[PDB]
Amino acid sequence: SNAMRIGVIMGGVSSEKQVSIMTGNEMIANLDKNKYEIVPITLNEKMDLIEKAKDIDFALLALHGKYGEDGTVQGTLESLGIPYSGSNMLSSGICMDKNISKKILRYEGIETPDWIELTKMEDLNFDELDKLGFPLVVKPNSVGVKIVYDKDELISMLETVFEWDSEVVIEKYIKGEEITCSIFDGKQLPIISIRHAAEFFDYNAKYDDASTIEEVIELPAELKERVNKASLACYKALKCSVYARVDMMVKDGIPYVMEVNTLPGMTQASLLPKSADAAGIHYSKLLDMIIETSLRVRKEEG
Amino acid sequence: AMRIGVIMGGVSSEKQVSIMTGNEMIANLDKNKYEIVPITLNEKMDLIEKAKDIDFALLALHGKYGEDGTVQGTLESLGIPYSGSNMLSSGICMDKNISKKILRYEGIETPDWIELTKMEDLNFDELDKLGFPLVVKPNSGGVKIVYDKDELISMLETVFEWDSEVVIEKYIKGEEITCSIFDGKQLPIISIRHAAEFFSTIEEVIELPAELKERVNKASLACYKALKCSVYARVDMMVKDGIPYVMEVNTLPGMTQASLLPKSADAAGIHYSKLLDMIIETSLRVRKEEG
Ligand SMILES: Nc1ncnc2c1ncn2[C@@H]1O[C@H](COP(=O)(O)OP(=O)(O)OP(=O)(O)O)[C@@H](O)[C@H]1O
Ligand SMILES: Nc1ncnc2c1ncn2[C@@H]1O[C@H](COP(=O)(O)OP(=O)(O)OP(=O)(O)O)[C@@H](O)[C@H]1O
Ligand SMILES: [Ca+2]
Ligand SMILES: [Ca+2]
Ligand SMILES: [Ca+2]
């Protein structure tokens, strides 16, 4: 039995590169050595992939952020006829574009927060802005998401963001419970709650706003059914394959989709593998399912 | 003197069109402004080696090879400015299902349709909301049309060798036109008529009635924006009862002198060599706006 040669693809620039290295190392360390011949691939520049992938049967992506999201790596691998993990080039690019992904979701009737799309030299229509109210969340579509409380803050923040990016999403702020829903091959995994830590005095909870805890949670049946329905619908709508993670906010019992991730964290401390583990899927087996399901999917694509 | 790669490639019929296109470009590119660097890709990824010799990639590509976005994404990753729409726009416009959803979300008129696959099961229900006749085309790209339930079911099986995904559209019976856009400005509209014997195909610049022209110009420009196209594009439409319908948006329209976009530009007084000058100049600006 000749072992399939798995390239573990690492790369990116700055902190993304480091997260990528850490991810690849975990994969390399947990890949079943009897099933696979493991081939670490570290990309000094993105297009070095063409040379380094000559010796692999499959590309397992350890990438993090733009390099793995924009779709170029997937498209290159496809052009080389080399099967790879996760969503394809178009699904990846769509999911990475928050504006375009929200349009498609909203077209499909999936709840997502109201928003304005704005490009760099484009003016800003204050009548539609006012419809949104304040606070607002400014999302580059290097610089992170930021809550702004009024017109002046918004203006100032647009100017900060636009120097680096040419496009922004301005989203209505929603105060609610944050959750994230991992999907593997069209099946919903355990939901994870993301909230502040509390100190409890009897039944009074005092929250620490500087903290964040992530915990697997079972939601009440009604909301659970609604959440599972929305997340799978995102998955199909955005043409995702193999696995994805949908980030949502719940208010008044209604889930809103903030984003869909085709390249979610894959370290053992990351949300998706934590969800899989709660589902009885240990890390090494999650890696087996990704390779196995990806091969099937790349074959269905031709 | 700026080094311009003329990039040609593809397989089969597409490659031939590509080489034909790149030759025309090489012939008409101003020799005083440019140093022209013919580039022919045997395999797609050979682009990486050959592109170290150039300051700009002018794409002579045709069909999926230049539509899916891999070439654009590769050149972007190499830091090499290139002509036309970027990887995301290209991929979106190549996907008829996705581009239709976005257009419709934006309130742009496009024929009613449904998405279908090899994998999935034909769903009897949704078809008959569409009625007949239907037009059947692969999702990723003459006219294949079906006048009854029987031709449809069969058509799908044959096509399904072609593509894994298919779009089924309501048949729009109308006057066919095509709208070339350059850097956000509409060029003269072209009318496309068909006759077994005229009183194959005729393409001519036609001045549309003022009102229709206005709706057409609005729709074509809205597609251009909605799909994030840049530098140039060609929107193909079907007019019925004064209402324009969008059939599709092309980020890589035919670029020969005999092709529709160059003819449209010609009708505006933009000669072939100058159209290339503008493609290069405009793309350079766009690529810089993107980062
Ligand atoms: N509309 C909103 N209302 C309230 N809080 C929000 C809203 N949008 C985002 N947030 C908070 O900001 C965080 C980050 O936003 P988001 O998930 O949309 O972008 P991202 O995760 O940074 O993008 P990427 O997928 O590139 O990592 C969310 O986890 C949530 O805590
Ligand atoms: N709904 C429709 N009703 C009537 N005629 C149509 C319809 N859709 C397409 N056609 C005809 O079929 C021809 C092909 O159009 P289509 O949109 O399928 O091109 P395409 O193959 O998607 O283009 P590309 O090569 O860029 O992928 C057109 O010339 C048009 O006349
Ligand atoms: Ca997120
Ligand atoms: Ca067409
Ligand atoms: Ca002239």
A13 Cβ under 8 Å from any chain B Cβ: no
Using the mean position of ligand 5's atoms as its centre, give its distance from the Cα of residue A229 in Å.
58
Which residue from B265, B251, B263, B254 is spatially nearest to B223, judged by alpha carbons?
Answer: B251
Query: If you write DSSP's letter for every residue of chain B in order, what string do you get?
Result: -EEEEEEE--SHHHHHHHHHHHHHHHHHS-TTTEEEEEEE-SSGGGHHHHGGG-SEEEE---THHHHSSHHHHHHHHTT--BSSS-HHHHHHHH-HHHHHHHHHHTT-----EEEEESSS---HHHHHHH-S-EEEEES-----EESSHHHHHHHHHHHHHH-SEEEEEE---SEEEEEEEETTEE---EEEEE-SS---EEEEE----HHHHHHHHHHHHHHHHHTT--SEEEEEEEEETTEEEEEEEESS---STTSHHHHHHHHTT--HHHHHHHHHHHHHHHHHHH-
User: Which H helix or E strand runs over A7?
Assistant: strand A4-10
Quote the DSSP letter at residue A139.
E
Q: Which residues in chain B precede a discontinuity of more than 2.5 Å between C and N?
A: 141, 199
d(CA A64, CA A9): 10
A182, amino acid identity: S
| Ligand 1 pocket member A132 (CB < 6 A) | no
Helix (H, G, I), strand (E, B) or coil at A86: coil
A100/B203 Cα distance (integer angstroms): 34
**CB contact B116 to A (< 8 Å):** no
* Alpha-carbon span A292 to A156, nearest angstrom: 48
Atom of ligand 1 nearest to the CA of A258: 18
Question: Helical H runs in chain A?
Answer: 14-30, 49-52, 66-69, 72-80, 89-96, 98-107, 126-132, 151-164, 221-237, 271-278, 283-301
Chain A residue with the nearest C-alpha to that of B72: A72
Dihedral sign from CA coordinates of B214, B220, B224, B225: positive
Q: Are A133 and A116 in contact (CB under 8 A)?
A: no
3-state secondary structure (DSSP) of residue A43: coil
Under DSSP, the state recorded for A34 is T
Which ligand is nearest the CA of A258, by number?
A: 1
Determine contact, residues A63/A10, Cβ cutoff 8 Å: yes
Distance of CA B19 to the CA centre of its chain: 18
Q: How many residues does chain A have?
A: 302
The answer to whether the CB of A175 falls within 8 A of the CB of A169 is no
Q: How far is B73 from chain A (nearest CA, A)?
A: 5
Sheet bearing A58-61, strands edge to edge:
A36-42, A4-10, A58-61
Q: Which of B92, B105, B228 sits opposite A106 (nearest CB)?
A: B105
The encoded tokens of residue A300 equal 């269905």
Residues preceding chain discontinuities in chain A with C to N over 2.5 Å: 141
A216 three-state secondary structure: strand
B203, B240, B248, B250, best to mutate for ligand 2 pocket (most atoms within 8 Å of CB): B248
Question: Which site among B49, B98, B115 would you substitute to test the A interface, given the most A Cβ atoms closer than 10 Å to its Cβ?
Answer: B98
- In whole angstroms, what is the distance from residue A115 CA to residue A172 CA? 6
How far is the C-alpha of A19 from the C-alpha of B54, rounded, in Å? Answer: 34
Neighbours of ion ligand 5 (CB under 5 A): B 269
Ligand 2-lining residues (CB < 6 angstroms)? B 111, 135, 137, 141, 143, 169, 171-172, 176, 238, 247-248, 250
Handedness of CA A133, A151, A196, A68 (dihedral sign): positive
CA distance B49 to A36: 31
User: Under 8 Å CB-to-CB from B218, ≥6 apart: which residues?
Assistant: none
Residues in chain B: 291
What distance in Å separates the CA atoms of residue B156 and residue B239, rounded to the nearest whole number?
27
d(CA A88, CA A98): 17
Q: Which residue has the tokens 């706003």?
A: A209
Mutate to test the pocket of ligand 2, among B140, B143, B145, B170 (most ligand atoms within 8 A of CB): B143
As a dihedral over the C-alpha atoms of residue A222, residue A265, residue A69, residue B46, rounded to 10 degrees, the angle is -140
* Paired tokens of B210: 């003022």
Which atom of ligand 2 has the smallest separation from the CA of B141? Answer: 27
Question: In chain A, how long is the greatest CA-to-CA distance?
Answer: 67
For A158-170, letters b (16+ CB in 10 Å) and e give: beebbeebbbbbb
Say which experimental method was used.
X-ray
Asked if residues B93 and B227 have their Cβ atoms less than 8 Å apart, the reply is yes
* Cα-Cα-Cα-Cα dihedral sign, residues B9, B15, B19, B20: negative
Ordered structural domains, chain B, with CATH: 1-83 (3.40.50.20), 84-109+173-291 (3.30.470.20), 110-172 (3.30.1490.20)
Q: How far apart are CA A131 and CA A133, in angstroms?
A: 6
